[PDB]
Amino acid sequence: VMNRLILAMDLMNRDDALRVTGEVREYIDTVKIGYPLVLSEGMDIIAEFRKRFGCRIIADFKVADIPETNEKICRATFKAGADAIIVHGFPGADSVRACLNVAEEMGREVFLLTEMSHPGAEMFIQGAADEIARMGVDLGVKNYVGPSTRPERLSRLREIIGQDSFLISPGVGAQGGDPGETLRFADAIIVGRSIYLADNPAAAAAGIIESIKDL
Amino acid sequence: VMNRLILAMDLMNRDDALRVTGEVREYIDTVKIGYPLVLSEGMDIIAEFRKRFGCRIIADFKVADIPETNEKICRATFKAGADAIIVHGFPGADSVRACLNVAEEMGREVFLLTEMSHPGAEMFIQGAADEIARMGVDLGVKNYVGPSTRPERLSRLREIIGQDSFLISPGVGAQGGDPGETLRFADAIIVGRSIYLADNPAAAAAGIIESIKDL
Ligand SMILES: CCOC(=O)c1cc(=O)[nH]c(=O)n1[C@@H]1O[C@H](COP(=O)(O)O)[C@@H](O)[C@H]1O
Numbered sequence: 001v002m003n004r005l006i007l008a009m010d011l012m013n014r015d016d017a018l019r020v021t022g023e024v025r026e027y028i029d030t031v032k033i034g035y036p037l038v039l040s041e042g043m044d045i046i047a048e049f050r051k052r053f054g055c056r057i058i059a060d061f062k063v064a065d066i067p068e069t070n071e072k073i074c075r076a077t078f079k080a081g082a083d084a085i086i087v088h089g090f091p092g093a094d095s096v097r098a099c100l101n102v103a104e105e106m107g108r109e110v111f112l113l114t115e116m117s118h119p120g121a122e123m124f125i126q127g128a129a130d131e132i133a134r135m136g137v138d139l140g141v142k143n144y145v146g147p148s149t150r151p152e153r154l155s156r157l158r159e160i161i162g163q164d165s166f167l168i169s170p171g172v173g174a175q176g177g178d179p180g181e182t183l184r185f186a187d188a189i190i191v192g193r194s195i196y197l198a199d200n201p202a203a204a205a206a207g208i209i210e211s212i213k214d215l
Numbered sequence: 216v217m218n219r220l221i222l223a224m225d226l227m228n229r230d231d232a233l234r235v236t237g238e239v240r241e242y243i244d245t246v247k248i249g250y251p252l253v254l255s256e257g258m259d260i261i262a263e264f265r266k267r268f269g270c271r272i273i274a275d276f277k278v279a280d281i282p283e284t285n286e287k288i289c290r291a292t293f294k295a296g297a298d299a300i301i302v303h304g305f306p307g308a309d310s311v312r313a314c315l316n317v318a319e320e321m322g323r324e325v326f327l328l329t330e331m332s333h334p335g336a337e338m339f340i341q342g343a344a345d346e347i348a349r350m351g352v353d354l355g356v357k358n359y360v361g362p363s364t365r366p367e368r369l370s371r372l373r374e375i376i377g378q379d380s381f382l383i384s385p386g387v388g389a390q391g392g393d394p395g396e397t398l399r400f401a402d403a404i405i406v407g408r409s410i411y412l413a414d415n416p417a418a419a420a421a422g423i424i425e426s427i428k429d430l
């Protein structure tokens with residue numbers, strides 16, 4: 001991804017979301033869009049962003065249902081133009097396989113969320129996360145998400161998935177993660193509030209990129 | 216809920232969804248709407264259903280993000296008119312608390328999903344599910360979801376949450392669960408495909424209700 005930086009666009013107003021994304025477009029090639037924006041403005045926002053900005057769109061929908069419903073969610077998401085979807089691994093292998101099947105059908109990608117970045121992730125997810133990652137490997141998953149807030153976990157995840165797999169990482173900035181440390185293990189970082197709540201989002205993105213180039 | 220039966224409306228077309236829901240409305244007072252329908256037709260479908268049918272709407276969004284994003288998802292969902300939202304417990308207590316805070320702010324309800332109904336739930340969720348339920352109790356959660364496909368698990372969940380908590384249960388019909396057995400432990404059953412894919416959905420719903428009355 002351009003500059004190894006993915007914008008997490010979680011503003012809930014189309015005008016604000018379009019303004020900020022346009023301001024930082026010179027510094028990214030990929031926007032993560034999630035439910036805060038889609039549930040506020042509609043699924044048509046994905047194709048609008050894709051067109052206006054010529055970016056790739058990752059739909060961060062944290063898909064976490066039974067296989068049959070997962071199929072439906074993935075199909076709707078790819079029909080709306082998303083390039084990839086983020087899927088939880090905690091519901092197990094059949095749930096993940098259902099997403100992979102739709103992605104194969106529609107020429108798209110699945111990212112497997114293995115261990116989350118917030119404090120509550122320690123309660124249940126962390127203890128399963130190595131297994132969730134190994135499940136991903138055994139299903140043929142090539143794209144993963146793991147936590148900037150715990151780079152030792154992010155190192156262990158990289159160890160399981162190998163060097164060829166693509167790994168993106170949220171929790172940089174607001175949640176306490178560091179760009180440079182996270183990029184020791186992840187291929188790209190996801191950044192939301194540190195950019196989209198900044199007085200000058202372009203300057204915030206530029207500042208991050210400057211520190212990335214320095215790596 | 217009327218007749219202890221909740222319709223899982225996962226058709227992806229507004230016309231089909233409206234037709235089936237209207238056909239079975241005499242037999243339910245509550246419709247579960249999830250992402251298959253919302254991502255296909257928009258969040259406005261919730262208020263449309265609420266108005267047309269005068270039902271309660273449970274938004275089955277399986278909320279499973281970090282606390283700050285969970286807040287945003289819940290706020291958007293309640294603004295759209297949903298009476299309650301289904302939340303995953305696997306992301307831990309802060310993620311669940313964020314949903315409870317918004318529900319308290321907006322006079323709504325959270326349902327905690329504790330153990331899922333599909334085969335993959337055995338891999339990671341089942342081993343954490345008793346703890347997830349006890350976490351719910353300790354957070355003050357009063358509404359829960361657990362699996363029709365495993366009534367011995369559904370008995371254990373009821374045991375943890377007590378008799379005053381409200382427990383609803385999917386997996387009846389298509390996934391192999393039985394109405395009567397499930398209602399030994401759950402207060403209401405969720406039924407999707409056995410009704411909405413039936414040649415005569417009203418007759419399917421009526422058949423289920425007849426077996427429920429017999430209990
Ligand atoms: C299931 C959500 O998927 C994610 O991308 C995600 C996983 C995770 O463990 N942590 C995490 O923060 N995210 C998402 O990544 C974004 C982080 O934004 P921010 O903290 O504002 O920089 C936000 O959209 C959040 O929902």
Ligand SMILES: CCOC(=O)c1cc(=O)[nH]c(=O)n1[C@@H]1O[C@H](COP(=O)(O)O)[C@@H](O)[C@H]1O
Nearest residue numbers: 065069223277331332385386389406407408
């Ligand atoms: C996270 C989804 O929340 C649920 O209600 C759910 C949890 C679960 O463990 N199992 C389960 O089947 N469900 C949902 O309940 C519905 C079951 O529909 P059906 O199998 O067609 O009768 C469907 O919407 C499914 O997504």
